[PDB]
Structure formats: structure tokens, C-alpha cells
């Protein structure tokens, strides 16, 4: 059909800049289901993330050309692909995760993929869905680094706060 080369070249260049690639078994899901998942994804990513159905053969060639390795396992049988080209990469995983849950689907259907290059398995999907966004991770990092200073201030002002605390407790008793 040769239009394949168009998609393989198209797909290949996409996989070179993705921050997320996740393989999902969407077999059995309906047309309405597809539209719905894509709608949830756009609500957060605009054009930045996609959920597409592509023949394993072409998908395999695109991944291959992208220089990825050990993905063959995720391609056993018709497989759809979820990927992010712009924005937080973790949110897309949380979206499809709770979507499968909303659909009472076997979460093992989320086979695995690559998170910013790092391969992850079906089991780790749940761990990724529990990760805070990258933006929140940065906020958390700032707090972790600052903890000694914050701990110092609170430890010191706590001596006076404990006074106010017990005093209100005495008042409370009456």
C-alpha cells in the first residue's frame, strides 16, 4: 500500500521526541470508548498526546528506526500506542489507567513502554500512575532540600507554640 512508509516515517520521527510511549491492548473496546479516551487525553494535552491504533508491523518498524530496544514483548498481538510529545509525561499514564478502571478492564492490558526512555513493565504502570507530576516533583524537591532549614525554624517556634497550645487546652477544659 506504500502509504505505510508515510506512517513509518511519520511514526519514527514521533518516537524520537516522545517523553512517553505506552503499549495497550485495546481489543474489545468500542468506537465510543476510543473517542472517549482521546477526549480525556485532549482535555489535558491538546495536540500534545495521542492514542493511536497502528499495525504491529509498522509500529515495530517505527520503534526500530527510533533505536528502541526490548519492545518486542509489548507487541504480541494488535497493540495501540499512547504517547506524549509535549507536556508532563506521567499524567497521560494516570488518564489511561483510570480509564481502563472506569471500563472494568484488565489493567494487565496496559503492557508497558518507555518513560522518557526508561523501559517499564505492565506491573510498573501502577507505580507510574502513583508518581506526582514532574511539576509537583520539583516543588517536592525544593521542600526536601529546604527541610533542614524549615525544621530548624519550626523546632524553635514550636517551644512557644506549645505554650499557646497547652493554654488553649486549659481554657478548653473550662
Amino acid at each position: 500500500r506504500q502509504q505505510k512508509e508515510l506512517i513509518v516515517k511519520e511514526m519514527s520521527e514521533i518516537f524520537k521526541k516522545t517523553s512517553l510511549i505506552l503499549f495497550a491492548d485495546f481489543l474489545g473496546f468500542t468506537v465510543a470508548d476510543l473517542t472517549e479516551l482521546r477526549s480525556r487525553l485532549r482535555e489535558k494535552y491538546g495536540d500534545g498526546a495521542r492514542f493511536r491504533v497502528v499495525k504491529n508491523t509498522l509500529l515495530n518498524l517505527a520503534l526500530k528506526n527510533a533505536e528502541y530496544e526490548g519492545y518486542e514483548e509489548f507487541l504480541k498481538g494488535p497493540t495501540a500506542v499512547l504517547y506524549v510529545t509535549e507536556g508532563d509525561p506521567v499524567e497521560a499514564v494516570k488518564i489511561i489507567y483510570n480509564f481502563y478502571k472506569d471500563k472494568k478492564a484488565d489493567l494487565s492490558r496496559l503492557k508497558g513502554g518507555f518513560l522518557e526512555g526508561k523501559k517499564f513493565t505492565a506491573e510498573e504502570v501502577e507505580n507510574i500512575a502513583k508518581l506526582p507530576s514532574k511539576e509537583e516533583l520539583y516543588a517536592m524537591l525544593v521542600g526536601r532540600v529546604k527541610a533542614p532549614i524549615t525544621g530548624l525554624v519550626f523546632a524553635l517556634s514550636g517551644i512557644l507554640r506549645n505554650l499557646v497550645y497547652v493554654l488553649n487546652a486549659i481554657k478548653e477544659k473550662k
Binding site: L160, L163, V164, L167, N168, I170, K171, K174
Partner: peptide
């Protein structure tokens, strides 16, 4: 006023009086 004396004066404070004490402590620092 030693620590015990301070405690005695506080034990004698009324509900509203305690509210004032706390209020003033918060402000003082």
C-alpha cells in the same frame, strides 16, 4: 514570679482571661 507562681496565676485565670493571655502572647511574639 518564679515558674510555680506563674502557674498559680494562670490556674486562677477565667476562660475569657485565658483567651486574652493567649491573644497577647501571640502578639507579643
Amino acid at each position: 514570679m518564679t515558674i510555680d507562681e506563674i502557674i498559680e496565676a494562670i490556674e486562677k485565670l477565667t476562660v475569657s482571661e485565658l483567651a486574652e493571655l493567649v491573644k497577647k502572647l501571640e502578639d507579643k511574639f
